[PDB]
Structure formats: C-alpha cells, structure tokens
Design an enzyme around this catalytic site. Structure first.
Site, PDB file in Angstrom:
ATOM      1  N   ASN A  56     -10.600   0.160  -1.423  1.00  0.00           N
ATOM      2  CA  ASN A  56      -9.171   0.119  -1.124  1.00  0.00           C
ATOM      3  C   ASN A  56      -8.463  -0.581  -2.277  1.00  0.00           C
ATOM      4  O   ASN A  56      -8.528  -1.804  -2.394  1.00  0.00           O
ATOM      5  CB  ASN A  56      -8.916  -0.607   0.200  1.00  0.00           C
ATOM      6  CG  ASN A  56      -7.423  -0.695   0.576  1.00  0.00           C
ATOM      7  OD1 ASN A  56      -6.537  -0.333  -0.201  1.00  0.00           O
ATOM      8  ND2 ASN A  56      -7.154  -1.161   1.791  1.00  0.00           N
TER       9      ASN A  56
ATOM     10  N   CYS B 169       0.809  -1.220   0.000  1.00  0.00           N
ATOM     11  CA  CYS B 169       0.000   0.000   0.000  1.00  0.00           C
ATOM     12  C   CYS B 169       0.844   1.272   0.000  1.00  0.00           C
ATOM     13  O   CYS B 169       0.310   2.350  -0.286  1.00  0.00           O
ATOM     14  CB  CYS B 169      -0.926   0.016   1.215  1.00  0.00           C
ATOM     15  SG  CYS B 169      -2.164  -1.230   1.250  1.00  0.00           S
TER      16      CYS B 169
ATOM     17  N   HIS C 282      -3.674   7.170   2.436  1.00  0.00           N
ATOM     18  CA  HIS C 282      -4.088   5.910   1.840  1.00  0.00           C
ATOM     19  C   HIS C 282      -5.481   5.559   2.347  1.00  0.00           C
ATOM     20  O   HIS C 282      -5.789   5.749   3.526  1.00  0.00           O
ATOM     21  CB  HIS C 282      -3.091   4.798   2.188  1.00  0.00           C
ATOM     22  CG  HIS C 282      -3.600   3.414   1.909  1.00  0.00           C
ATOM     23  ND1 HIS C 282      -4.220   3.073   0.726  1.00  0.00           N
ATOM     24  CD2 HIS C 282      -3.570   2.284   2.657  1.00  0.00           C
ATOM     25  CE1 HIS C 282      -4.565   1.797   0.762  1.00  0.00           C
ATOM     26  NE2 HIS C 282      -4.166   1.291   1.917  1.00  0.00           N
TER      27      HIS C 282
END
Lengths: 327, 327
Positions: free
Chosen positions: A284, A114, A254
């Site tokens: 996500n 990520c 994020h």
C-alpha cells in the site's frame, strides 16, 4: 477543439529494497504467514537512505513520458499527488518537472492522502479539456519513513512507490473521463492522523519521532468507511456514465488490503478477475497505488480502444473518489 | 452548457492578534520604522494559541459562500491551497468542507507555496467548466508558526490569513478566465526551504529547532527570480488574452513586499493606482494574499461587469503563475 483527454503514457517506479513479510513478522513478533493471511501482501519495496520522493517520482514520470513518446515542450503542467514530499517547503513537484526536463510545465503538489491521484486525475482532465495541453499526473509516496512500529497496520501495509500517467488532449467525444465523483467526509478526520508537525502542533524540541508518525483510532471503522466511500462513489460514476458493472473491463481500486478490494468489488457486482491487484507485490503506497496499477496492467495487456476502467479510492480525511475512463 | 466560471463570492479572515511593526522591531532589535521602510508592511495578524488553519480557512470560506448566496449542495469541490495544514495527515480541506456544511463537496489540499491559489483557481475553473458545478477555492496559511526570528525577511514579512472565492458555472463565453499561465523553475528549489519534517529528513528526537523553520539562502536572488516569474507569466496571459496592460482594471499580485509589487507593476506598464495593495495591513500570508486582496478590493468597490483583473504570483520551488479574469 479538445473534448476529452487520453491516457497516453504510463509509468511506475519502486525503490531497490524488496522487503518480504518474514522480515516484518519477525520484527513485530508475528507468526509466519500473518501478513499475507490478513492483508494479501506478500512483499513490498522500501526506500533506502538517500532515496528521495522526487527521485522516485522522476523515474515513474520519465517512464510515462517515454511510453507516450511526447515532446517535453508539450507538458504544460505537472501534478504530484503525495503525502511525503522531500521537504515541507517547497513542494516537490517543481523539482520533479525540472529533473524531467519539462521546461514549459507548471507544477504543484496535491495532498489528498490515499485519494490524491483520483483528485489529480480529475483536475488534470479538466485542465486538458479547457486548455488543450498535456499534463503529467504523478503520485508518489515513501510511507516506510512514516511507519509507526506501535501501529501494526502501518508496519504491515505501508510501502514506497510512484506511478504516473501522461494525459493528452483528444478531439473525440464520448471517451476519456466519462464521469468522476469526488467526495469528502470530515466527520472521519480523526480516524487516521499524524499528531505533530502540522500547524496545530509544530514539531518542537522535546518531542519524539512517534508524535510525527501515523496513528489510527479504529482500523475497522476506517475499513467500513473506506469500503462505503469507494462503493458509493463508484455506483454514482457508473450511473452517471449510464453503465453497469458488466461494462467495466478493468477495475482499479486503491490497493489498501486485499479484503477491502474484495469488498468493493463484491458490493459493485464486478467479476473478481476484472480487478487489477498489485497489493501482493507492491503493498500500500497510498496515492501511488492506482497509477502504479495502471502502469502494471497496461504493461501486461495494453489498454485497447473501447475498454472501460473504473478507478476508485478512499483516503484519510476522509476522502473518496471514483472515475470512469473509456479508452 | 457551462462555458466560463464566475467569481461569485469572496471572503477573507485573519486571526485576532494584530501585530504592529513596533513590536517586531523591538523583538529583533531593529531601529524604528525599519520594517515599513524595507517591506511596505505596517501591521499584520498572527494566530493565537489554539487557532487552527482549518478554523481560519472556515471563516473566509463561510464569508464567500454568504457573499455568493449559494446553496451548500451546489459546492462539488473544495480546494484548499496551504503550506501549513493542521496536520501532516490528513489534509485539512475535508475538515474545512465538513465544518462549512458542504456535504456534497469533495476536498483536497494544494501545496504550491505562494503560487498555490493561482494554481487552485486555474484548476477549479477547469473543473467548473468541465462538470458545470461550483467550487470553493480557499487559500490559507499560518506562517507565524513557521517564522525563524534569525531569518530577518521571514520574521518581518510573514503573516496569517485566509481568503476564499466561490467559483460558479456560467453559460457565457468571452468572460471569466480568459487566460492562465502556470510555470515552474526547479533550478531555484533550494532558495527557500524547510530542511526537516519532509521525507528527506523526517522529524526526529533531538532535531535542531531551526530545521523545522523557513530558511532562505539569497533574498536578492529570490527577489529577482520572483519578479521575473510574475513579469513573464503576466506578459504571457495578457498576450494570450489579446490585451494590454492598459486594459487591466485591477492588478492583484501576490503581496510579498511593496518593492516587488512595484517592480512587477512597473515592468508591465500598469498604472500604479490600479494595483491592489493589502500588504500594508495584512502582510505576506503566502497563497492567501491574492484571495484576501480580492475580498478586500471587492468589498471596497464591487467588481463590475466588463472589468478585467490580472492576478500573478511566484513562490518557493520555484513556481509562478498569472491569470486574466474578465468579470
């Protein structure tokens, strides 16, 4: 001659299949409203059969080149942050650059889970400032094909998207990337993992697909570690840039779940309305989250000279990072 | 304040199993001497069961930190160029930084096939020069676990190794990386490929074993493309540095096979005795070959101030690159 980099163009892309929560809650036997209540996601996009990662990345990157009005010959380097390349060999970035007509561009993939885009952004900025040439910084993932039905977090969070930014050289000082802090904490290596397909356990004959899907030991431990990574890196780049949370115009974390964004925003003392939130509609998508959010917020309200963004991410590994960028 | 980067420390590492040509020639049913005749390899190292990519990278990285005599806290970033990470998630670099005690280091993996180290070196140099902080640039591969015995080139070339360089900030100009050229040519994307395990064909039950292993459509096309990529990038960085081949002290090409190194050397007009040649004992370990060769040649004869190195590589994708480095 070059002293900073400029985010000159933005783009994002998602596959065609919009997947509402209700479909997934039915699949998992979840009560209605479960997903939005616990993650803040309302819908997300998933690849269809035949969709490729490099094709999705290509649409986001083409949008960013167009936004930047840049000659294709000016792109010296293409960096693709992805955990889900078309093939395990070769990397997908050379195909990306080829399809986009970037015939003078190098190309390489970055694997930072990520955190991949913030690493790529920091490294691209260093390249722009050192060589005075432009970089296409892309991040793209098809996590839907990594979804583990037994891992409820993955089923409910994971989505498919690409974002991209065109970074161009600029002669001005005291703007662009003011500070960056890239951290790693491999003590958390085993918290989020795919067991097989790497070199430690190559995928073999008698193996199931779920050995090649993501597993998570303790979601709460991932949650607290990721909040801490993003909080601590964010605090450091703010202090390095000699700024406070009040000087941030837009906060772009994020997009893992809404509660994690809220936690970091709160820890930093940032006003909640300054936070860019795309998780409701885009889910996500791992490293694609921040550049997709940058493209969305810039489309809503173009970035204005003097504005200051704080970008921050955490990832499996575990890894984290933060960047202060001054328009 | 930082104007250049210095290669401060070198290190390399190989697994314990030394595999001479004779064992492979018997395995494949080739006449004696076949492999050395066609590749210039005499022997190479392969992992044993339980060896990890991160553990092999760790031994090369520790050797380089030792060689650089650097404080662990001075490493701000660890870059790991690899095609064969321990797991598909997470990246191996955070584990690498963790095992080496690099508690202030960020970490990310770079996937650039055989070109991966020259991209990581170029990006690290930009980081060093932008932030004035040191970087561990590692490259490591366990290709033996990706060998297809039916693809004869892969069976007789592929080897396991790691190399690493500690890049430190240097206040002096006109030294360090004088020029770098990173190129990509996705028209050759399908030439070298692994079909399964990526997002285009994820690992599944009942997948053909060969589908997870390397494949090559036309080795001669790979050969001529790779020679051209290395020749053309090397010519470019030489002209950008205002140098000729006669000014190069040590020529370190990717160690793919002896004939490829000789073709590029000849194309560039470089004296053959200036070529660093490790393929004979260490085979082709993809992105690891250049830092392993730097570690070997610097051990034989320490790099001396004023020496000029030319590094060049080409890889699947296709990608290439070249770097001119002034000690």
């Amino acid at each position: 001659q070059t002293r900073s980099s400029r985010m000159a163009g933005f783009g994002h892309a998602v596959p065609a299949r919009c997947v509402d929560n209700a479909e997934i809650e039915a699949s998992l036997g979840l009560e209605a409203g479960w997903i939005e209540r616990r993650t803040g996601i309302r819908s997300r996009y998933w690849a269809e059969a035949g969709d490729t990662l490099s094709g999705l990345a290509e649409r986001a990157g083409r949008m960013a080149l167009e936004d930047a009005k840049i000659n294709a010959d000016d792109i010296a380097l293409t960096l693709l942050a992805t955990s889900t390349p078309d093939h395990l060999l070769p990397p997908s970035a050379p195909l990306l650059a080829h399809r986009l007509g970037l015939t003078r561009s190098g190309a390489i993939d970055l694997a930072g889970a990520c955190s991949g885009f913030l690493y790529a952004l920091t490294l691209a900025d260093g390249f722009v400032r050192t060589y005075g040439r432009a970089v296409l910084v892309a991040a793209a993932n098809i996590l839907s094909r990594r979804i583990n039905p037994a891992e409820r977090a993955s089923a409910v969070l994971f989505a498919d998207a690409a974002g991209a930014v065109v970074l161009t050289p600029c002669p001005e000082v005291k703007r662009g990337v003011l500070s960056a802090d890239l951290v790693a904490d491999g003590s958390g290596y085993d918290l989020i993992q795919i067991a097989a397909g790497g070199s430690s356990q190559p995928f073999s004959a008698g193996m199931i697909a779920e050995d090649a899907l993501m597993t998570m030991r303790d979601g709460r431990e991932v949650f607290s570690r990721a909040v801490a990574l993003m909080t601590n890196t964010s605090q450091r780049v703010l202090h390095e840039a000699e700024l406070t949370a009040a000087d941030i115009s837009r906060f772009v974390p994020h997009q893992a779940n809404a509660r994690m964004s809220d936690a970091v925003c709160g820890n930093l003392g940032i006003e909640r309305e300054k936070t860019v939130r795309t998780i409701g509609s885009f889910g996500n998508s791992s490293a694609a989250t921040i550049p997709l959010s940058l493209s969305i917020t810039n489309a809503e309200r173009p970035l204005a000279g003097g504005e200051t963004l704080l970008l921050t991410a955490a990832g499996a590994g575990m890894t984290g990072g933060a960047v202060v960028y001054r328009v």
